[PDB]
Each structure stands twice: as structure tokens, then as C-alpha cells.
Symmetry: D2
Subunit: 188 residues, 4 copies
């Protein structure tokens, strides 16, 4: 493939990700106002749980939340059922990330988290998913297709969740009057 065609191939995949993000910005985002309220009410930490590519995005979001004034950390969904559920305490709010909302590792956390009683938020592509139905607050972040020809590799979905989560973090930060000095305290 010549250089101009290689460049056009790269831009094609980028453009597929851009379109997925546009789709979300153009949607009503009705449950987001409730999402902000629940997160503002959190007296503990916002605990993000995920596995696979969603799990790496969940790690970035926990870091971004914390660095911008919303105490947060990540628990890997497998490690959760090997003891790390002990990291979650009564005042913590839990955000579980799964694009399908069927990921077996994430569903496996739910019987314990129901017993523990924490408020559960899901980020998935469908309010009808198993995970979304089991949570207290389902946030639907629809994603039509992944960027590859067979639609198999998380690319549109992981990017959309990252953009949505970053914006939620920055809104919480602005609303709580987080300052340059507070940013400097955590990033010296």
C-alpha cells in the first residue's frame, strides 16, 4: 500500500471512532443529571470495576476522577472476587463498566455487592443488559459498531466510555469548585 493510501486507512479508523463519539454527544443523555447527583452525594470513594479493555479505561477514569477532586480508585473485576471486594466499604459508590453488560467477570461481582449494599452504577451499551438491570442506576452509552471490519476490537466503545467519563469527572470538578492549588497538591 503506498503512503497516501496508508494515511487514508489510518484516518478511516480514526473517523469511525470520531463518529461514535458524535453519536453520543447528539443523544439526550437523560440519566446524566441523576448520575452527577449520585456522585456528588458520595461520602466515600467512587470505585470503578472493569476487566479487559473497559477495565483499562476504568483505571484511567478512576485516576482522572481522583486528580480532579473526586476520591476514586480501580478494582479489577476478577481480583474483586479473589478478595478485593474487601476494598469497597459502606459509603463507597461503585461504577461497573461493561460494553455488552453481559461480561461474566463483572456479573460475578454482583451477588456480593448486593449483600454489601452499595449503590451500583453501570456504564453499558443497553439498559436491557444483565448488568444494567442489576444496578441501581443504569447509564446507557450506545455504540453501534467497533472500528475494525469485523467489529470485534474495542475501539469505538472504549473511546466513547473514556470521553463520557472524562466529561463526568470535569463536570463534578467544576461543580465542586476544584482549584489550581488543589490540582497542584495532587500533581506537585
Amino acid at each position: 500500500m503506498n503512503n497516501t493510501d496508508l494515511i487514508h486507512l489510518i484516518k478511516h479508523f480514526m473517523h469511525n471512532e470520531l463518529k461514535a463519539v458524535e453519536e453520543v454527544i447528539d443523544s439526550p443523555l437523560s440519566e446524566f443529571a441523576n448520575l452527577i447527583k449520585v456522585l456528588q452525594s458520595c461520602q466515600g470513594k467512587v470505585v470503578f470495576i472493569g476487566v479487559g479493555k473497559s477495565g483499562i479505561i476504568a483505571r484511567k477514569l478512576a485516576a482522572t476522577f481522583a486528580s480532579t477532586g473526586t476520591p476514586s480508585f480501580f478494582v479489577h473485576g476478577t481480583e474483586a472476587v479473589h478478595g478485593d471486594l474487601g476494598m469497597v466499604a459502606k459509603d463507597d459508590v461503585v461504577i461497573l463498566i461493561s460494553n455488552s453488560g453481559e461480561t461474566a467477570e463483572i456479573l460475578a461481582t454482583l451477588p456480593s455487592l448486593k449483600k454489601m449494599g452499595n449503590y451500583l452504577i453501570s456504564f453499558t451499551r443497553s439498559h436491557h443488559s444483565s448488568l444494567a438491570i442489576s444496578c441501581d442506576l443504569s447509564v446507557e452509552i450506545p455504540v453501534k459498531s467497533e472500528a475494525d471490519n469485523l467489529g470485534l476490537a474495542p475501539s469505538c466503545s472504549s473511546t466513547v466510555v473514556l470521553v463520557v467519563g472524562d466529561a463526568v469527572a470535569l463536570a463534578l470538578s467544576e461543580l465542586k469548585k476544584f482549584t489550581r492549588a488543589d490540582f497542584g497538591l495532587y500533581h506537585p
Copy 2:
């Protein structure tokens, strides 16, 4: 803040990220053809090195490369200088991610990596940065501003690097004729 204003605030941050991605898709991406060639020539693993938010994106990109047929793994930039440079062997190609190209932890890897002799690629916002000048192939991914009012929190920059890296992965994958069956082997 009422519900419609909270929603508009969230969409504002999302839109700032969208614009940064658009800026990159609209640019020439001249060095990308060379980037693809170097990565296709790799007989070892593509080793991604980063710290902070770039480092979490570098972890996602290594996973995406591997899952789509380009053997790759992540080495945290601090851990690298505590021994993990031993993970990098002669045939490995190294991609070092730093938005400023001045991150002290990333620069600290360079005297050893020069002695080790591996081909070094940087992803930074400026060909003039310290990191870009020390690498064999500098890839410039400019980012005008972060999405927050003070421009302090990686949001536009981490998202742009993610989109660019995903597209590079998917192009390498398509070019090497990676199949549904190969995807299934690594994702059973």
C-alpha cells in the same frame, strides 16, 4: 445547576475532546507511513512505555496491539529504571508516550535504551521536545488545550493518543491479514 444546564456542561467537555480528535484527523500525519513500516519490520514485541495518564493509555494500546495480531506489552516508565528495562530485548521496538515530551520519568529511561540499541519511537505534542529529539522516529500528535478551564487535566491529550494508537493497531492488523479465527484464539 438545573438538569438541562448539567447536560450542556457534560456535552461541552465531550465536545472539547471531539474537536481535538478532529484537529488530528484534519492534519497531514506525514510520519505515519514511516511509523507503519517500522512497526511491520518488528521481529520482537512493540514495548509501550509511559507514566501517569499517558501510561494508562499506553497500557490500553499495548493490549489492543496484541489482541489484533501485533505482539506488544507495557512497561511502566518508573518500573523501567527499577529493573524492568530487562524486559526489552534486541529485536523489540519501543514506543515512549509523553504529551509534553519532557516527562522526567520517561527521559530517565533514555541513557539505558541508547546503550541497549533498540529503535525508539516517541508520541509527543512536539518534534522539538527532549523525548522526540532523542528518539529514532518522532510522531507529533499536537494537542492545543486540555478540556478543563485551566487546561491542566489530561483529557484531550489522552483521548487523542488513544484514537491515534487504536487506528495504527487496526491498520497493522488489516495489513497483515489478521482473521476472525486469530481474534478468537486470543479472545476465546
Copy 3:
């Protein structure tokens, strides 16, 4: 080297680690009673901070604490100064692990943690170290030599810290009357 000599070489390194652990069990452990008291008083999470090999042991200890009824999580020492200090909130107690007590990344956390006001505990080989002197409670875990001929590779030191930390976790667990049913809740 023949098989019997290879086996004796492996046992030699194992034996060097065993001796370092014995040295600690034979010591007074005077400050451990105070350590238990501080950890029992924690109303938040026990936050472990480390980098390099100490950092991986710190990750294991945070998991072991949590799985046995003491809410705890790990913050990497570099990531801490890139924003993750925002994970630590007023009621959290911090354990910083550094064998020398001079590790630059760990010392770099201290000006912010002093401003944030949390009670700081160090695990180091010397009460005279920079880290130990800056903390509220210094726990000295002396280690004479690493297991390799040049004494360079953390082996005796990382193992000793692991054994000491596991025992502290299991004592807190027994003292708080942690049950089989609670273990099952976090490990379903």
C-alpha cells in the same frame, strides 16, 4: 553444573531468604504493638504506597489486608505525584514502603502528604532513613544483605516485608473477629 549442584544452588538462595526472615522473628518488634493500634483506629482505608519490588509487595499487602477485613488499596508512588494523591482522603492512613527509606519517588510524595495531614507509617530498614524520619510511625525491618552474590536484587528484603505485612494483616483480622462468612463474601 550437574543436577545435584543446581539443586544446592537453588536451596542456597532460598536459605538466604529464610535466614533474613528468622532475623526478624528473633528481633523485639517493639513498635508493632503501636502499629496495630494505629491500624485498628483507621476509620478510612489503609493506603499502601511503593515503587519497584517494594511496590509489588505493597500491592500484595493491600490485597491481603482487604481480603481479611481491613479496607486497603495500593497507590503507586509515581502515579501518586501524577494525581493519584487525590485517592487519599482525610480518614485514610498511609503506609509507605521503601527498603532503603531513600527512594526518590517515595520521598517526592511527602510534601503533599504533610499538607494533606494523614497519619504516615513507614516500613524501611532504618529508623534513621529520610522516609522514616518524615513519618509519624517508623517501623524498622532490618535486612542485612540481599540473596545474590553482589547484594543488588531485592529478594531477602521483599520477602521479609511480605512476611511481616501478612502477619500484621492476619493479626488485625483475628483481633476484629473476621469470620469464614466474611471471607466468603469477598471471595465468592
Copy 4:
């Protein structure tokens, strides 16, 4: 509990870990000579796979191997079946760590790894375990009991695996004539 009794309680758990290590040093370690030979023959990377507490020890061992001259990295057992199996290439040797040798996440890697053809080594408590029987080389590291009263928390088992793995790393390092200068290259 008074101070002298708290100290004796801590030393009791430490002593339980010490005894488990002694049990192993006193055993024949027959398959270790073969283990060294296979690891010396590796032309690629030694890839450690684990989850839970074994997985954190597997992360420490990969780092220790690399820092002492045996290129190695860690792949989490869950992430492996979400794509990270793509990190393992034909010349890589795989060490899978599971104390029971029945851990579901670790067994789930095996159909793909059999198709991929890599030489598989297991570290488990029993040659009869599912994992041990599926591997090319089973290394049995027996552990009678964990250190807690109910024998539930990995403590003796994770410590024994750490000591055994450190010694294997240091033996490979000595045998290949790894130097102070090479240590300094990876740890500058």
C-alpha cells in the same frame, strides 16, 4: 490484648510462613534441574500468568527475572482470555502459577495456549492438579496449610512461591554470568 501478647501473635503468623518455606528447602526439588534447563533454553521471554494473590507474586517474579538478566513479563490470567494471549509469541515459555492448580481463570487459558504450542510450566501444590497435568513441566511446591486459623488466606503459599521463584531467578542469573554492569544498565 497487651503488647507482649500482640507481638507473640504477629510472630506466630510469621513463624507459620517460615515453617512452610523450611518444608520446601528440606524437600528433594527433583524437577528443578529440568526447570533450569528449560528456562536457559528460552529464546524469547518467560511469560508469567496468574490471578489473585498468585498473580501479584507472578508480577514480582517476572520483574525479578528481567532485572537479573532473564527477559520476562507478566500477563494477568483474565486479561489473557480478553486478548492478551496475543502477547505470547512462538519462542516464549509460559509459567502458570496456581496454588490449587484448579483456578478457573488459569485453566481457561489452556485450550488457546495448546493451539499456540508454547512450552507450558506450572507452579502448583500438586502434580495431580488439572493445571499440572495439562502442562509440559509440572513443578510441585507443596503447602500444607495457610497461616490463618481457617487456612483461607494465601500467606504460606504466596510466600513459598515467591522464595522459590526468586531462587530460580538468581540461579539463572549466576549461571549466565550476569554482571554488576548489566544490573546497572537496567537499574540506572
